[PDB]
Amino acid sequence: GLPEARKLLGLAYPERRRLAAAVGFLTMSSVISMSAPFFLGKIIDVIYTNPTVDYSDNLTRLCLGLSAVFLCGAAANAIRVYLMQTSGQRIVNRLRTSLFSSILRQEVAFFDKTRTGELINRLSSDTALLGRSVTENLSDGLRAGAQASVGISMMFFVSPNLATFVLSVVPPVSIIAVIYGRYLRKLTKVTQDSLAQATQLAEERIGNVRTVRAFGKEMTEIEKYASKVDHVMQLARKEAFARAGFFGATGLSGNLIVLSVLYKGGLLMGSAHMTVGELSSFLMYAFWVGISIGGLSSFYSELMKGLGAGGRLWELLEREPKLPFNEGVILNEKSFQGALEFKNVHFAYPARPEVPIFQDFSLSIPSGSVTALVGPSGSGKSTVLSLLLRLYDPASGTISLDGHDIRQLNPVWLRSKIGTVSQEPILFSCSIAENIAYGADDPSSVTAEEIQRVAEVANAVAFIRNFPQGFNTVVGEKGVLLSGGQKQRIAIARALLKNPKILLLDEATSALDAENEYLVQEALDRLMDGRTVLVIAHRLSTIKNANMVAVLDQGKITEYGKHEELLSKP
Amino acid sequence: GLPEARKLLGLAYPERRRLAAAVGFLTMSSVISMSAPFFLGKIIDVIYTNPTVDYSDNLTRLCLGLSAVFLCGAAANAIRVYLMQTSGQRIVNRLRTSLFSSILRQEVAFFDKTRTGELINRLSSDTALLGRSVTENLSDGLRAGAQASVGISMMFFVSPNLATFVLSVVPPVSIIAVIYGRYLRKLTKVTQDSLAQATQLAEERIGNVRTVRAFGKEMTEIEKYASKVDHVMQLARKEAFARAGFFGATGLSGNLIVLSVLYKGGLLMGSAHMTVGELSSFLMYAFWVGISIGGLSSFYSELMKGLGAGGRLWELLEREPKLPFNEGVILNEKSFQGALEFKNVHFAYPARPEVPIFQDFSLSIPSGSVTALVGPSGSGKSTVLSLLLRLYDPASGTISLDGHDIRQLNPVWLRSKIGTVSQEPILFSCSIAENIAYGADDPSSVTAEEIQRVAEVANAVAFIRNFPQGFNTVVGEKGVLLSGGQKQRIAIARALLKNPKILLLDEATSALDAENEYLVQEALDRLMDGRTVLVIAHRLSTIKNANMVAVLDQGKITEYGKHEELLSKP
């Protein structure tokens, strides 16, 4: 309501001087324009009164004068439109940057409960709506509002009898038409509800054609759908009958209302209360009020749509992340060794809080050691990485870095010290070089020599240069699809460029081939060297060579020790 | 072109009598309507010539007569709209059923290369377009075409000088405006291309916020996006300048063209070549031609859109499935025993033809035996089920049922004999009872007693009745979410109701809990009894108890025999 309009006020505020200039051009053009029916009525009565008089010179002067008025009106409109559009574009730009900045500051839990599609609809559609609502739509309502105001005033000035008549007739007709319109909307909802059901059934059955086939139900589904769409046709016929009636009734009413004005006006002329010019003026103003009422109606719908968008954008713009974005301490070179400690950690994902991942999880990972995490569910093991990068906070317990609770540190800084290599790595739809550069604190500051060096160590340089575009080859989803081994080696190149003291590896037991597996293992060994390594082990070789082995069973470290001492225990 | 219009012809053909009646009402209304500027010009000249004459009785008779004309016109419009809408609805209904029927007849390979979203856009949007293109849009172009035709003819009848003048002036202005319009479209594309890039970047980075966080790149992405949207603003300002110029130029040109007609017309009146009424008639017809040109323009855009839709729908309607839908033999009771044979089967999925799944795969599954399929990739093992249900055909080799190549049999029938229980079952968004009933050849013919019986055997009846709605509980995605064990037991209830001689089980090694695992194993044992079972084994108990064990290595049966004889072999 009142604080909503206050937010729309401040939104247009940085552009107040452009919008004021444009409103000034809009007022000038709209009010000068409103004078034409009045002056046309005077000319109509002049021709009527004097049919024997030569009007060539007046006409030539008037048409030369009107040319000049039209050139001015065109210049004023050009300026007004440019000022309005550019004002909106600046507002939408400020909405895009502000909205994107807030979204990326939110905790992972927020993304867990919010769909990417909805956030993109807010960044696309809602920013467009909100931007034009305080500009184009505000100008549109302002013109229509002034033109109904001037029009109605001019109808009463031209003839207080005919204006009072129109004002007594239109409202009852408009009220009845609104009630008929609301009925027609309900018959439309009934049809579109039924059509939505049929389309959802169709979508489900196409999407699960393998299950449909498997049970020999293609013919059944075809007949089911045919029954649903035959019922839609039944509803659509009822709707069509009500729509035909409405268009007939509103059309007749519109025509008869105009006819009544021509008839009452015709009689007022005969009785000398009015001239033909005066009636012409009245009808032009009445028609202009009609259009202006339409304009105010369209302005109200777009204002409500823009306020709807406004509520959705102020929701994210004002959202305070439930986890700090760039806040906390940084450790010095002397104190940062890369030792990690889990102490009585309890955790369940925000989306599935009913499923406990950790239940009193304690694990001590000393500096420069290789600790192999072993256990049943990989969901539990993979969650360790998420908590170490503080994507989430434990429900209970603490995670410490060199004795410091990771909550007391700058999360951006914490993450710069912890590198990761996934079973299935994520590469953005940009060049290989940009993807590798991403590892650096400053990816625009990396040299081609640094990118090439880590690409050699990661055993990635040969397949990259074997691309026609080389390091300029656009990868990701929207680009060139890479093999699992190729994606992993670029992930290792990125890790090497990051150069973290702590490394978290998730071993890929799902897929690896004779050619890739060798060059990936060789690169992973070079990467693992001189770093605190936490590895979700699947390969027997990494478990035997690891300094320690941790058994994760039902979200707790049940057994911990060297691989050999673990075989002789149970 | 010519065969395209021939298809649109036949589309409207079943509704030819409704559409003819509506066109008749459209022609009547449009041609009677076109007479009003002519008759208004005569009345204008009558008032002008006789200002001293009482016209009250003529006006009252004319307004009573026009009331009757308006009541007729309203009735004709109501009928015309109803006939047009209902004709389109019948056409769209025939397009929905025909299109859905063709889609579900297509082989699984088709769905492998076609997105569900695209098929739903063809069933939603394109059926709507095509249906209104031969109805509403055809009527719209027909009215506008007749009204430009009558209008232009009437402009020449009213004044061949002024009509020739307008015809010499509008085309040069229209050509120049088209060239300026095409330029403005290119500046718009440049802006919207840039905006699409920025939005895609935003979508990717929001969608991969975990990777962005992990490398401390939230601030980098925010600044990257801000750079892209600042560049969009630069393009949008250039576009805004060209749009402002175009609206200024087209506005001025429009106004000056009308002014030229008022001036030339004004001079023709002075020289006695025309009357005020005649000029009024001419301007009304000129304005009506203007609107009609707009109407023909809108009709051409919608005709092209509808032809675009038409090409996409005739593509699927005329597509011949690359695998038979409901064609082939059925075996008798005596000859159907449920014995299966794979002979030198070679296969690679249509989407990934570079990856061979089977390379000379041969496996003999005798009637009433339990064969356990064991091996590395589960992708290979799961493909056996797809080939047995003939969702695909082998590239080489044969699959036989009781000595008959499954290609020679009716695939619907073949599938009625082969049941399946997946690790992750598929349940539609309908009642539990409807989901269970799906197993039957006639799911509407199953009794509540039959559904309850299989639900008891499947150990499903207790959790189903423990639902507030019971067997009426809507499950699937759009409904009540069930546990893995609950979904599996309903899958077993459906299998029991199907009562197949052959059963294909995919053992769920991913998830199973102490409570579910017992009741699911008990139900699976009752289901496995007296049937030819092929089980993708993960549980050691099922491999030891199985009649035979088949080792699948690199898409071939490397070792086959009893579990004990297999341990002493390598």
Ligand SMILES: CCCCCCCCCCCCO[C@@H]1O[C@H](CO)[C@@H](O[C@H]2O[C@H](CO)[C@@H](O)[C@H](O)[C@H]2O)[C@H](O)[C@H]1O
């Ligand atoms: C859905 C559509 C609904 C439309 C409703 C139609 C309503 C009918 C319209 C009737 C119009 C004619 O209305 C008629 O106007 C004249 C002229 O002002 C009035 O006539 C009276 O007042 C005028 C002055 O105003 C005097 O000159 C005249 O001598 C006197 O008789 C009539 O009292 C009135 O009945």
Ligand SMILES: CCCCCCCCCCCCO[C@@H]1O[C@H](CO)[C@@H](O[C@H]2O[C@H](CO)[C@@H](O)[C@H](O)[C@H]2O)[C@H](O)[C@H]1O
């Ligand atoms: C569908 C219906 C379409 C018809 C629309 C309504 C037409 C009404 C019928 C004709 C009534 C004629 O009414 C007549 O008009 C003229 C012109 O204004 C009036 O004339 C008055 O104004 C004109 C200026 O236009 C002066 O030149 C004249 O000295 C003055 O008396 C007459 O005093 C009046 O009697």
Ligand SMILES: CCCCCCCCCCCCO[C@@H]1O[C@H](CO)[C@@H](O[C@H]2O[C@H](CO)[C@@H](O)[C@H](O)[C@H]2O)[C@H](O)[C@H]1O
């Ligand atoms: C972007 C907008 C472009 C708009 C272009 C504007 C073009 C200029 C319009 C000029 C209109 C006036 O055009 C003028 O009309 C009169 C009246 O017919 C013509 O006049 C001539 O023919 C008429 C008959 O038709 C005779 O009665 C008259 O005595 C004779 O001089 C002039 O030869 C012509 O020049």
Ligand SMILES: CCCCCCCCCCCCO[C@@H]1O[C@H](CO)[C@@H](O[C@H]2O[C@H](CO)[C@@H](O)[C@H](O)[C@H]2O)[C@H](O)[C@H]1O
């Ligand atoms: C922005 C410009 C707006 C103005 C639009 C154009 C107006 C032109 C200027 C006035 C010219 C007046 O021209 C004058 O019109 C009248 C009315 O048709 C003509 O009169 C003719 O028709 C009328 C019927 O309407 C008859 O009653 C009359 O007997 C007959 O001669 C005159 O012979 C002509 O000289």
